């Protein structure tokens, strides 16, 4: 199945409170495999997974370095962005980026991205082709001409097409179990009394791994996701998650309602009724 | 393994 290895970078200037906070987080798929923090006691790239243990002290040191570079590397950006917009010092700002790629079973490269986010609104980014850049505002204009008149596109393109990939593989080589493991959600339902001879039926799902899941309520073979009630998935806070949904149904009319839990770690979707 | 980003 498709897989990824994206990198999340963020530098936020805290004028006065010192030098900007900078840190990058590594994600092979949606698991956190490595991060680095400026406000760290001992700044150093840190292994956010047992298996990352198989990576040498050299690896750490290496990226450790590479990081610190990018550290002051972004420090610059900040100034530069500031100048470009005509805004004087003072307002703490946040630069963020997502650089990454996506290989799929055959190893072919599905997608490569590098996107610059300034203070929360799209700055610039490398198009699908991996050759041009797209930017908003007369300012971000100045920036493209730069990255292009320097080869950036190309050099970037190599990382994505070659580096992130060769590595993404390696990571998977050793992270497998941890990344390929499953945990079947545990569901149940609840009856919540309510005025006007009606009750709230809530379908609980929790203890499941892979964070993607779908829940649905039915009344004899018909979807009710419509006037239903949902909650963004809850990090169960222990390598697993939680999610529920519910709907109002006349009292007594419970037995006629059914919830469905479809989750990739389930041979047969889960089916509950009251 | 990460990139060596450029300025702006």
């Amino acid at each position, epitope marked *: 199945g498709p897989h990824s290895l994206r990198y999340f970078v963020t530098a936020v200037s805290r004028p006065g409170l010192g030098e900007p906070r900078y840190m990058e987080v590594g994600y092979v798929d949606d698991t956190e495999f490595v991060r680095f923090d400026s406000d760290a006691e001992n700044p150093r790239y840190e292994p956010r997974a047992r298996w990352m243990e198989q990576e*040498g002290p*050299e690896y750490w040191e290496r990226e450790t370095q590479k990081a610190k*570079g990018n550290e002051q*590397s972004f420090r*610059v950006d900040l100034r530069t962005l500031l100048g470009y917009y005509n805004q004087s010092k003072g307002g703490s700002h946040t630069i963020q980026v997502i650089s990454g790629c996506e290989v799929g079973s055959d190893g072919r490269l599905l997608r490569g991205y590098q996107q610059y986010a300034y203070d929360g609104c799209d700055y610039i980014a490398l198009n699908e082709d991996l050759k041009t850049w797209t930017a908003a505002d007369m300012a971000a204009l100045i920036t493209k001409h730069k990255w292009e008149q*320097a080869g950036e596109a190309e*050099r970037l393109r*190599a990382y994505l097409e070659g*580096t992130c990939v060769e590595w993404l593989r390696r990571y998977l080589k050793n992270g497998n179990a941890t990344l390929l493991r499953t945990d079947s959600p545990k569901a149940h339902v609840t009856h919540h009394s309510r005025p006007e001879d009606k009750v709230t039926l809530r379908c609980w799902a929790l203890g499941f791994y892979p964070a993607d899941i779908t829940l649905t309520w039915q009344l004899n073979g018909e979807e009710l996701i419509q006037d239903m009630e949902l909650v963004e998935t809850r990090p169960a806070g222990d390598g697993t998650f939680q999610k529920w949904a519910s709907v109002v149904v006349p009292l007594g009319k419970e037995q006629y309602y059914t919830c469905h839990v479809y989750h990739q770690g389930l041979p047969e979707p889960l089916t509950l009724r009251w | 393994e990460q990139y060596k980003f450029y300025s702006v």
Partner: T-cell receptor
Framework: EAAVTQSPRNKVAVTGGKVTLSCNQTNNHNNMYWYRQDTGHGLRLIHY???????EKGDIPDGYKASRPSQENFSLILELATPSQTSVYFCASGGGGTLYFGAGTRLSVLE | QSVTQPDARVTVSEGASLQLRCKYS??????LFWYVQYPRQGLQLLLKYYSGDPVVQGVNGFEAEFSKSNSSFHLRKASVHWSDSAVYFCAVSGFASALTFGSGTKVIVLP
């Protein structure tokens, strides 16, 4: 175009002399440098920047200092000059690793 | 972070094939390069290897082949031509926008 103007290109200076070499560019390359061409060691990195203000140490730091005022003017500065700092100095602009070097400078400080 | 041009001097008969050794140490895919320097002017780039095809085709019959097993980015041009007599340097880009050059190799092609 993209010129790496490196001046002066030569100087005979005295020991304990403060000598500054400047490098003007037109490559718009944020990354500027100062390397030193000497036999048995080839070239070596003195100092490097990422844009006005950004300044850090290379591998050959002792005695050398540097300034980054414009997205253009970079400059390796030697105050406590000693002949050990005798060599062909080279600076350069660069995006990721496409270093554009300059004409050079024959640095001859004497006793 | 390490580079090595075992031989800093090699003389060859014009016409003939030329292969300048180069080794490097860094447990990862560095950014390797090769610059040319002839009389007085500074450095000149021949090519660059970031990632991708181990065999790079560059300016003036110059090409190289990257390799792992035990490191290398040996330069290559088969039909050497006098004017090529010079100093060819091999650089790497380790922990950020730097260019850790190695000693170097002065080649001489007798006509």
């Amino acid at each position: 175009e993209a010129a790496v103007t490196q001046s002066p290109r030569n100087k005979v200076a005295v020991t304990g002399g403060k000598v500054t070499l400047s490098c003007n560019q037109t490559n718009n390359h944020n990354n500027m440098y100062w390397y030193r061409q000497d036999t048995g060691h080839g070239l070596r990195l003195i100092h490097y920047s990422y844009g006005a203000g950004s300044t850090e140490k290379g591998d050959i730091p002792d005695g050398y200092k540097a300034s980054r005022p414009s997205q253009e003017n970079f400059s390796l500065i030697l105050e406590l000059a000693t002949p050990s700092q005798t060599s062909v100095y080279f600076c350069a602009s660069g995006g990721g690793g496409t270093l554009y070097f300059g004409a050079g400078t024959r640095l001859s400080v004497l006793e | 972070q390490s580079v090595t041009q075992p031989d800093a001097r090699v003389t060859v008969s014009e016409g003939a094939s030329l292969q300048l050794r180069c080794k490097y140490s860094y447990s990862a895919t560095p950014y390797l390069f090769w610059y040319v320097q002839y009389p007085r002017q500074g450095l000149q780039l021949l090519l660059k290897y970031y990632s991708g095809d181990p065999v790079v085709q560059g300016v003036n019959g110059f090409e190289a082949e990257f390799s792992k097993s035990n490191s290398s980015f040996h330069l290559r041009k088969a039909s050497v031509h006098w004017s090529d007599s010079a100093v060819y340097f091999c650089a790497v880009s380790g922990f950020a926008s730097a260019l850790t050059f190695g000693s170097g190799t002065k080649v001489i092609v007798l006509p």
